[model samples]
Target: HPAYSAREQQWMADHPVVKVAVLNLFAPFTLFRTDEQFGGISAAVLQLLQLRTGLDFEIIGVDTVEELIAKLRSGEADMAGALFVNSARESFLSFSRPYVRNGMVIVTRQDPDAPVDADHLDGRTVALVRNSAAIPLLQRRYPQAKVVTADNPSEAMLMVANGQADAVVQTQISASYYVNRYFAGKLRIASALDLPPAEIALATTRGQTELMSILNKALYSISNDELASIISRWR
Candidate 1:
């Protein structure tokens, strides 16, 4: 465990604050406002790590996913909170041990009969966000379906809710809230993809293994009860 040593911790205490990138509205995981007063599972968990390491974390805010990714790629922040790990992201960012679970699922107003793929949807419409990871995924996985892009994920969900589209594809962690808050009992999970779970983790700059090690150690050190309580705040 070649993490931060006592000297390093004291050094961090004396040094300027480290910025941890945060998405402005990635709810449940991150929920920062215009003023930066925020609380979510990701932010709370990182707050714990700061105490143990003696580092002051200034939450850096960004509106778009690309902007958040830029914070890592451009060295705008030392690390960022609650991002899903993917093959492309691994090139520029280092991920800590996963702290939470997420799954991509299909939501529809009807009881779906089969998988929600291209051939299955055939001549149907699918709703997804314009500038999101889910766009390329839906296009690749459901090629034949007519895809309509929304300004955001919630609008994509609303399109399906309003019968403008057949279904919405999004992570269960993200879609579940919109379903309950916006669609309510009108929609239900048609299919949870057979794909593996999307484990959410904090992302640090690539090649920075020392910081990554500290984050992982602090993450696993927290009791399950502590984690559960954070989740309960949103549920």
Candidate 2:
């Protein structure tokens, strides 16, 4: 709030409400409840943002990444609640500094001698979350391995436990979150993947530099303690 300049302040004043699109079911990150209320880590962050900046954000939930992109392109939304960085998206989107990062990991059923890395999984089946960006990355990385997609994380882990898949490649935070919460003793993180960690940030359409700058300033002002508290609540 205090770090933002007059131009940024004026931009906020002029556009009092920023429409932010969120995925419908990216649990513990950006998800909507049964009553359609935004409920997740990203929602908590957006709540803090409103308190700190006095900018009301209207949350729009979409069922898929394609829908989110369509909304942003059609002007139905001015921003995304949270997104992993992509070079392709940069052509039309401007991102705030990342608020959180989580690396990819290989998860296997409770066993110590399981294959961990991609190089070890020749001809093995690996489950990935449907619509995850990791799909293409891991597919390209594990050319010899058979790839499968599950509708959600729980299903992906369950596939591993049931011997349907050898392991799962997923973000470390949510993968561990589910493992600790529901799959305790049933699954374990086998190894860290070679890919980059998921750097989640708020994104606005390109050319909205004023809003993007203001968002970055607000993001910078949030203390590590505050972020930790929010993240701990979800975990």
Candidate 3:
């Protein structure tokens, strides 16, 4: 009866409401605001998807990744927002087509004009988010470097800004978001890493083909300009 296919329309009519679990602290992408509302780039995208698909989204904020995944596995949540698709996650959740692609980058307090010499990482301390995918990539690439783990992005950026660490390795999006928001002029993106980019997408319960297809269609319908506006609004 609308833009969606008959199958998609039927599925939406049968299951019109979706519960989306989101991280409470991953700023600029997915995070809960001070007023307890879910707000971020992913939030904006989900809101757009809701309008496009005519589905109601009930957002649930969780404190940790473990809790978010647990909700999905236990049927407490219907989907998760903005997770990087990987084989490990694929075993348990079906992913929508990627909505955002991000890569790792090095952040340093060094001068803006100078290129970051990643080879100089040896013998220097680097800050990273605890349980980050960059951990293994960095350790394997720069084996001689000292690694310091932080609870979150802001803390890692602060480590470099305060001279507690020489540099920070994190996703380019988050590095830019934090630096622009809090550390302007104090830190700059030194360089990008060689690892594969993180393809961010929504993850629904495994084998939920209809819902996955619907989300993919909605994602594909969003224009590049609209996506840019949503991402820039958060940063």
Top candidate (lDDT): 2
Question: What TM-score, computed on C-alpha atoms, does each candidate reach?
Answer: 0.79, 0.84, 0.85
* Runs with alpha carbons beyond 4 Å of true place in candidate 3: 1-7, 110-115, 162-164
Q: Write the per-residue lDDT of candidate 2 for residues 201-235, one digit (tens) a residue.
A: 89888877787888888888898899989987765
Tens-place lDDT per residue, model 3, 1-235, is 1257788788889888888999888877898966777878898999999888889998889877789889988989888987767666667788888887878888889665333656677778889878776777788888998999988777888889988888898778888888888889888888887777867789988867777888888998998898888877754
Q: Please estimate how well model 3 matches the true structure, expressed as its whole-model Cα lDDT.
A: 0.82
Clashing pairs in 2: none
Better of 2 and 3 by lDDT: 2
Candidate 1 Cα outliers beyond 4 Å, as residue runs? 1-3, 6-16, 110-123, 130-151
Per residue, candidate 1 scores C-alpha lDDT tens digits across 153-189 of 6678888878888877777777677677767778876
Among all windows of 10 consecutive residues in model 3, the one with the lowest summed lDDT is 110-119
